[PDB]
């Protein structure tokens, strides 16, 4: 039912997440943004190295338990 998603930020800010395999990852993104005070865009989440779709869900990633997700501050060239 619930999977362990380790959302580790880039400033030692770690948070444990419990998400259902039926619910989308869009709500997971909303939970982290409201509990961290950062616009939905500002960041970026990754898995298996590759980026994460906004409509994604373990339904597609087959993410087992204890999995990990990386978040990177969003940026662009100059």
């Amino acid at each position: 039912e619930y999977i362990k998603l380790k959302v580790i930020g880039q400033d030692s800010s770690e948070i444990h997440f419990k998400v259902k395999m039926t619910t989308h990852l869009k709500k997971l993104k909303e939970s982290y943004c409201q509990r961290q005070g950062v616009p939905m865009n500002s960041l970026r989440f990754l898995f298996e190295g590759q980026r994460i779709a906004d409509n994604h869900t373990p339904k597609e990633l087959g993410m087992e338990e204890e999995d990990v997700i990386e978040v990177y501050q969003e940026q662009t060239g100059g």
Partner: peptide, 13 residues
Amino acid sequence: DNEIEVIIVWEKK
């Protein structure tokens, strides 16, 4: 609970 449900609670070391 009914539609969507996500529980988030960490613990510091």
